[PDB]
Amino acid sequence: SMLTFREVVSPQEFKQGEDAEVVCRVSSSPAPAVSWLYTTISDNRFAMLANNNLQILNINKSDEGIYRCEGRVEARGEIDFRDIIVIVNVPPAISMPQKSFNATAERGEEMTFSCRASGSPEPAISWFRNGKLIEENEKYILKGSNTELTVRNIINSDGGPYVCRATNKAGEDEKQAFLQVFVQ
């Protein structure tokens, strides 16, 4: 008969752009009246479903926060609540402002490619050459959480594309830069 919150998982994670359903399973006898707070909610994308869950259409990163599921046994003036942390994951999106680079072979030249990514959780950035993971050594320098790849001692075989990939639990992005190598 008393308010029981059987399922109020926190946090609950959702992918940006999905129609999120925030789950709150609360029971009592008589059945509970349920309201959601974040102060009461009054937005066009927000609505309570028949099962009392909170729907957030087209959920956005900015919707992230603490939402309160409140149950009331109105017959007995009993009111209880649980707070649920809503997290919004955002797939990576790479910024690679320059995609075309030139260098001249066999002059000791180096070139740095830049790749930054937005996303949540923080995307891991890796570079690939011919589909193979590039690791730091005498030829390749990686700086700034792998956002800057430097190719050292450029020769002809360094010409062609280099790919940066940005990955998190919500997705992956990739962009391709090309190095043109001239003969002296």
Swiss-Prot record:
Glycan attachment sites: 60, 102
Q: Which tissues does the record link to its expression? A: Expressed most strongly in adult and fetal brain.
Q: Source organism's superkingdom? A: Eukaryota
Residue ranges annotated for the Ig-like C2-type domain, each copy included: 3-85, 91-180
Could you tell me where this protein is found in the cell? Cell membrane
Q: Which cysteines are joined by disulfide bonds?
A: 24-69, 115-164
Q: What is the purpose of this protein? A: May play important roles in selective fasciculation and zone-to-zone projection of the primary olfactory axons.
What is this protein's name? Neural cell adhesion molecule 2
Organism of this sequence: Homo sapiens
